Amino acid sequence: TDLSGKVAVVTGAAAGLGRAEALGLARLGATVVVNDVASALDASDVVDEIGAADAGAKAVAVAGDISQRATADELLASAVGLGGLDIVVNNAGITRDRMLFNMSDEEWDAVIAVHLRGHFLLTRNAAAYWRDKAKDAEGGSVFGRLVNTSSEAGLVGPVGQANYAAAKAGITALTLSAARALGRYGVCANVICPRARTAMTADVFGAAPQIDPLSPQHVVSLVQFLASPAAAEVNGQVFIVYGPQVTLVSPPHMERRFSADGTSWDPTELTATLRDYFAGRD
Amino acid sequence: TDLSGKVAVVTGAAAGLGRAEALGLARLGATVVVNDVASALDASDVVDEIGAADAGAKAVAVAGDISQRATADELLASAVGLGGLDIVVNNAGITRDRMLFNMSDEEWDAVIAVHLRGHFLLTRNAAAYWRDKAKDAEGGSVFGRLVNTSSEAGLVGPVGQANYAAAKAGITALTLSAARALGRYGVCANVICPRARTAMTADVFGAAPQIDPLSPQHVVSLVQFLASPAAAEVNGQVFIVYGPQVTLVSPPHMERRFSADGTSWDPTELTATLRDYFAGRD
Numbered sequence: 001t002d003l004s005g006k007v008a009v010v011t012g013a014a015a016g017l018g019r020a021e022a023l024g025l026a027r028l029g030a031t032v033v034v035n036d037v038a039s040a041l042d043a044s045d046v047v048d049e050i051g052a053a054d055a056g057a058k059a060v061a062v063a064g065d066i067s068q069r070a071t072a073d074e075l076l077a078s079a080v081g082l083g084g085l086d087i088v089v090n091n092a093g094i095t096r097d098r099m100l101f102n103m104s105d106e107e108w109d110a111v112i113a114v115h116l117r118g119h120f121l122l123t124r125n126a127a128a129y130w131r132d133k134a135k136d137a138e139g140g141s142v143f144g145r146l147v148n149t150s151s152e153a154g155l156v157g158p159v160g161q162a163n164y165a166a167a168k169a170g171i172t173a174l175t176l177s178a179a180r181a182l183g184r185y186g187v188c189a190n191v192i193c194p195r196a197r198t199a200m201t202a203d204v205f206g207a208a209p210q211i212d213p214l215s216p217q218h219v220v221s222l223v224q225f226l227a228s229p230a231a232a233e234v235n236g237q238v239f240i241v242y243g244p245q246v247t248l249v250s251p252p253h254m255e256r257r258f259s260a261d262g263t264s265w266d267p268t269e270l271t272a273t274l275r276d277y278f279a280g281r282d
Numbered sequence: 283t284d285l286s287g288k289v290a291v292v293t294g295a296a297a298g299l300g301r302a303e304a305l306g307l308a309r310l311g312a313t314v315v316v317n318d319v320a321s322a323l324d325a326s327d328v329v330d331e332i333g334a335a336d337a338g339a340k341a342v343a344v345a346g347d348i349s350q351r352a353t354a355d356e357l358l359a360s361a362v363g364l365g366g367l368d369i370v371v372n373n374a375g376i377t378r379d380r381m382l383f384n385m386s387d388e389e390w391d392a393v394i395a396v397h398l399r400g401h402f403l404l405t406r407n408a409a410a411y412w413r414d415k416a417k418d419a420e421g422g423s424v425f426g427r428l429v430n431t432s433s434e435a436g437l438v439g440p441v442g443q444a445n446y447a448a449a450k451a452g453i454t455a456l457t458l459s460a461a462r463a464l465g466r467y468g469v470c471a472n473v474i475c476p477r478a479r480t481a482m483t484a485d486v487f488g489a490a491p492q493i494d495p496l497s498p499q500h501v502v503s504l505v506q507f508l509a510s511p512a513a514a515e516v517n518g519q520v521f522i523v524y525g526p527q528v529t530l531v532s533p534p535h536m537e538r539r540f541s542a543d544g545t546s547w548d549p550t551e552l553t554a555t556l557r558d559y560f561a562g563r564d
């Protein structure tokens with residue numbers, strides 16, 4: 001799964017999971033464009049840490065708020081300047097947790113902006129770059145890998161995280177569309193829903209106690225695959241990954257269909273049917 | 283399922299499904315606050331049409347872009363001025379379809395704003411109103427019904443609709459959080475994924491040919507239930523509804539787990555396992 005000669009963009013890569021992902025791609029030979037907000041990069045040695053330095057191992061930092069069009073444009077330009085854009089790992093995020101009934105517009109908008117708009121801007125920019133490259137190839141295949149970061153919160157809607165859950169669910173649907181649009185060009189686009197012990201999850205998961213059962217490395221192993229030639233037949237998939245396991249999420253299932261016997265439901269009859277079903281139901 | 287004495291807010295109710303939903307609640311006795319953008323209301327007789335007029339049947343139009351905080355505030359104030367807010371049907375939406383690689387930032391932001399931010403602003407405002415009412419009741423139960431509108435596109439990510447799919451998936455996750463926060467106060471919050479023949483779906487579904495198999499009325503019957511006392515035991519549920527059937531969507535299922543036998547996946551081994559699984563897989 002060697003990534004020599006490839007260029008990867010990883011967002012939110014100053015610390016935590018994004019930093020671990022940037023290091024894992026660098027270790028496979030990728031040239032990594034490391035993105036984060038500038039204050040995160042003030043306090044990070046990640047670029048020095050990416051002197052790991054078997055392989056071309058080149059790394060460059062590009063500071064910017066991923067929710068801004070200009071950041072996505074600069075990342076693309078940096079990657080083109082390094083020889084072409086091959087791999088995108090959308091990982092940047094923030095939380096503004098609040099009970100829904102106390103959540104301000106700003107708490108909502110900020111989380112939507114960094115997760116959902118940020119994923120969009122770079123996914124769209126990459127989408128346009130990869131399609132144009134395929135047309136420039138006179139219909140030839142392009143190598144492209146898109147790895148977007150959702151969360152089990154987007155499947156579940158946890159209390160106090162309506163904004164985080166909404167962004168992560170949107171990210172999943174965004175990536176499925178991208179997979180349908182781009183798979184025909186040779187691009188693979190997939191979604192991960194990780195759990196990893198980082199400084200930002202330490203309050204929920206605890207601190208690290210072989211290998212940490214919630215090591216970021218458990219996630220990196222999957223991201224390395226999804227970024228590689230070897231994932232050519234994996235597109236539009238959603239994975240849950242933490243510890244020594246990866247789980248493929250299936251398409252939506254149906255619990256129960258409630259059909260009228262004729263051309264329309266009688267409304268009081270529909271009411272009776274649903275009310276009875278949910279009276280005896282957990 | 284009589285809604286006499288209740289007040290309902292329906293957004294996007296000048297035409298199409300929202301208009302049919304406003305009429306169906308009015309027919310059950312609800313006082314309806316009809317919301318849409320003002321240009322939609324220029325061309326609509328919906329308020330006159332809500333002279334149906336058994337029951338209090340009162341209806342008032344409140345024009346506003348639902349993506350703006352002030353519209354959500356005015357709708358709440360109107361409902362309080364009519365005696366209290368009981369029912370919210372978030373239905374307003376737009377499409378800006380485009381292949382992802384051609385999608386502008388504005389095409390993305392507008393669809394996110396009207397669907398996702400609009401759902402949020404009114405869901406949050408209602409959430410704060412219903413909780414405060416319960417506290418004012420010294421812990422007493424409040425009647426509250428929230429009906430949000432997602433889409434099968436949010437489960438599926440169709441080509442050319444990454445922005446629509448992302449908004450609808452976010453709406454679902456938003457509503458699940460709301461259901462967890464608010465169910466304890468007596469509020470029910472549920473999601474519908476409709477198909478209905480409207481002027482805006484006529485290009486995809488065709489025109490209307492008993493009853494139209496894609497009549498908006500098939501959806502209205504479910505919305506009437508979900509807005510009613512009779513749905514007290516239905517909270518946090520996701521329904522697909524079109525024609526003479528309602529389908530309860532189940533929580534996410536897992537297709538297949540890929541576990542290492544020890545404390546971590548060997549990355550080349552994980553690659554081998556996933557590559558083999560997806561070689562022989564549709």
Ligand SMILES: NC(=O)c1ccc[n+]([C@@H]2O[C@H](COP(=O)([O-])OP(=O)(O)OC[C@H]3O[C@@H](n4cnc5c(N)ncnc54)[C@H](O)[C@@H]3O)[C@@H](O)[C@H]2O)c1
Pocket residue numbers: 011012013014015016017018035036037040064065066067091092093094114149150151152153194195196197198200201
């Ligand atoms: N829900 C879960 O179970 C779970 C657990 C771990 C990680 N995650 C997801 O994985 C990702 C990383 O999480 P983490 O555990 O590394 O925590 P983290 O706080 O380290 O987030 C990673 C990075 O995002 C960066 N970032 C924030 N705003 C940015 C912006 N506007 N532009 C660019 N970069 C920005 C931060 O600076 C940070 O370094 C996130 O998407 C997160 O939601 C989810």
Ligand SMILES: NC(=O)c1ccc[n+]([C@@H]2O[C@H](COP(=O)([O-])OP(=O)(O)OC[C@H]3O[C@@H](n4cnc5c(N)ncnc54)[C@H](O)[C@@H]3O)[C@@H](O)[C@H]2O)c1
Pocket residue numbers: 293294295296297298299300317318319322346347348349373374375376396431432433434435476477478479480482483
């Ligand atoms: N994907 C599907 O299968 C499907 C089919 C039908 C309806 N739907 C959903 O149901 C809802 C209504 O769809 P429709 O079929 O009635 O089409 P429609 O175009 O009539 O949409 C309904 C209303 O939304 C209103 N609206 C738009 N922007 C607004 C804003 N900024 N503020 C307030 N109101 C605004 C429009 O003016 C319109 O009257 C939407 O949510 C739509 O996505 C989905």
